[PDB]
Amino acid sequence: YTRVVWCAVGPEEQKKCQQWSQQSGQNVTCATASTTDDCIVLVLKGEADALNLDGGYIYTAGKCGLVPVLAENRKSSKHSSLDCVLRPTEGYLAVAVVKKANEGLTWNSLKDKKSCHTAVDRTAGWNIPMGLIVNQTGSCAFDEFFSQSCAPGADPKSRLCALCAGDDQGLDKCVPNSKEKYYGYTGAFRCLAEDVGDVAFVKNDTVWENTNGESTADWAKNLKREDFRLLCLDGTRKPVTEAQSCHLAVAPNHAVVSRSDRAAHVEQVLLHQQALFGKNGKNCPDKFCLFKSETKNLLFNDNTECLAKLGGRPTYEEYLGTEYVTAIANLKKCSLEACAF
């Protein structure tokens, strides 16, 4: 039993996974696919064991019978005595971010603007903002709301992909993987930072992690926090320090999923793998760090302190929360219970 097959999304995650595989002495090995959905399918077929997923994807995986195993836990300021692995998770803040210099843009004037999204089907990047927009407009035509977008996973010829840039060669425009310039938390924030889009749908952490010298990357080197504003649901604009009072939702943390039959073994191996290559890992600083990838958030978010135990042995619905689950279901009525594959 003692061999885990991880699923990497796109070639950059594949490279990191391969490095992890070498360092783990083949206790972990690698399968790779072009999209998160394709990785879920590999897991369903039994051709991979597990991968770490945004909540929108957990919904897809869970409808197909896959179960939550361990959750990303970032640093906090409550439960400070408990070990990270045993500390409850707090969830992240889904936000809408704009330029300060884009004056007079508010939640209530987004129609016909230009948007940047992590990917179709993701929590902060898609399910939350598009769910809110569908409800408020009373329309399922969320594909005509913004003039142009980068929403990796959408039809490449459509307005929803028009602002996506693809790779160095301009290949893979709008692919939902790290090859697409504007993919994920960091890519969607870059899309806003470079003024390609008017609004980015990301999380609070993303803004902090890519401003005021936190990044060193060329697009991010020179970005100042005061040059960004958050859009509140009441139509107000706030500094990025006010995220606790100006967010779109609180999201369940990204989490590892697997087949029920493999969950116990995946959990055992991962707890051991992080003891070696996690935050204070025995071999991290030094040989390999599983939670770093120079802000590219590959396999796991770079702000992950550890993978934490769940408790209550939750179903995917209990993990995501009834609130969020119904919000996703309601949104998916635009595009009632079954596996998508």
Ligand X SMILES: OC[C@H]1O[C@@H](O[C@H]2[C@H](O)[C@@H](O)[C@H](O[C@H]3[C@H](O)[C@@H](O)[C@@H](O)O[C@@H]3CO)O[C@@H]2CO)[C@H](O)[C@@H](O)[C@@H]1O
Ligand Y SMILES: *[C@@H]1O[C@H](CO)[C@@H](O[C@@H]2O[C@H](CO)[C@@H](O[C@H]3O[C@H](CO)[C@@H](O)[C@H](O)[C@@H]3O)[C@H](O)[C@H]2NC(C)=O)[C@H](O)[C@H]1NC(C)=O
Ligand Z SMILES: *[C@@H]1O[C@H](CO)[C@@H](O[C@@H]2O[C@H](CO)[C@@H](O)[C@H](O)[C@H]2NC(C)=O)[C@H](O)[C@H]1NC(C)=O
Summarize as ranges the residues that interact with ligand Y (CB under 6 A): 75-77, 93, 131-132, 135, 204-205, 208-209, 214, 243-244, 323, 326-327, 330
The one of ligand Y, ligand Z, Fe ion, none whose footprint includes residue 24, by CB under 5 to 8 A per kind, is: ligand Z
The one of ligand Z, Fe ion, ligand Y, none whose footprint includes residue 131, by CB under 5 to 8 A per kind, is: ligand Y
Shortest distance in whole angstroms from residue 249 CB to Zn ion: 7
Backbone angles phi, psi at 327, to 5 degrees: -60, -45
Q: Do the annotations mark residue 125 as ligand-binding?
A: yes
**41 vs 124 by CB, closer to ligand Y:** 124
Alpha-carbon gap, residue 51 to 181, rounded angstroms: 22
Please, which residues bridge with residue 256 across strands?
52, 70
The one of ligand Y, ligand Z, ligand X, none whose footprint includes residue 68, by CB under 5 to 8 A per kind, is: none
Shortest distance in whole angstroms from residue 22 CB to ligand Z: 10
Shortest distance in whole angstroms from residue 253 CB to ligand Z: 25
**How many residues of this chain bind ligand Z (CB under 6 A)?**
4
Backbone angles phi, psi at 30, to 5 degrees: -125, 130
Q: Residue 290 in contact with residue 298, Cβ under 8 Å?
A: no
Alpha-carbon gap, residue 7 to 5, rounded angstroms: 7
Q: Tally Cβ neighbours within 10 Å of residue 338.
A: 7
Alpha-carbon gap, residue 82 to 314, rounded angstroms: 21
Tokens of 45: 């077929």
Please, which residues bridge with residue 13 across strands?
none
Residue with tokens 């508010």: 106
Q: Is 244 in the site for ligand X (CB under 6 A)?
A: no
Residue 66 is given by DSSP the state -
The one of Zn ion, ligand X, Fe ion, none whose footprint includes residue 322, by CB under 5 to 8 A per kind, is: ligand X
| CB contact set of 323 (below 8 Å; sequence gap of 6+) | none
One residue of 6, 20, 185, 324 binding ligand X per CB under 6 A? 324
Q: Residue 25 in contact with residue 3, Cβ under 8 Å?
A: no
Q: Do the annotations mark residue 89 as ligand-binding?
A: no
Q: Residue 119 in contact with residue 125, Cβ under 8 Å?
A: yes
Shortest distance in whole angstroms from residue 331 CB to ligand Y: 7
Alpha-carbon gap, residue 201 to 120, rounded angstroms: 11
Q: Do the annotations mark residue 79 as ligand-binding?
A: no
The one of ligand Y, ligand X, ligand Z, none whose footprint includes residue 91, by CB under 5 to 8 A per kind, is: ligand X
Q: Do the annotations mark residue 185 as ligand-binding?
A: yes
Report the b/e string of 239-254 with b at 16+ CB within 10 A.
ebebbeebbbbebbbb
Distance from the first to the final alpha carbon of the chain:
27
Please, which residues bridge with residue 328 across strands?
none
One residue of 68, 125, 176, 252 binding ligand X per CB under 6 A? 252
**156 vs 314 by CB, closer to ligand X:** 314
Per CB under 6 A, the segment of 1-9, 10-18, 299-307, 315-323 that binds ligand X is: 315-323
Q: Is 24 in the site for ligand Z (CB under 6 A)?
A: yes
Q: Reduced to 3 states, what is the DSSP secondary structure of residue 184?
A: helix
The one of ligand X, Fe ion, Zn ion, none whose footprint includes residue 151, by CB under 5 to 8 A per kind, is: none
Range 113-142, binding Fe ion (CB under 5 A): 123
Range 31-60, binding Fe ion (CB under 5 A): 54
Q: Do the annotations mark residue 118 as ligand-binding?
A: yes
Shortest distance in whole angstroms from residue 202 CB to ligand Y: 11
| CB contact set of 208 (below 8 Å; sequence gap of 6+) | 214, 225, 240
Judged by the rule CB under 5 A, the positions of this chain that interact with Zn ion are 318
Judged by the rule CB under 6 A, the positions of this chain that interact with ligand X are 90-91, 250-252, 312, 314, 318-319, 321-324
- Numbered residues of the known binding site for Fe(3+): 54, 92, 185, 254
Judged by the rule CB under 5 A, the positions of this chain that interact with Fe ion are 54, 123
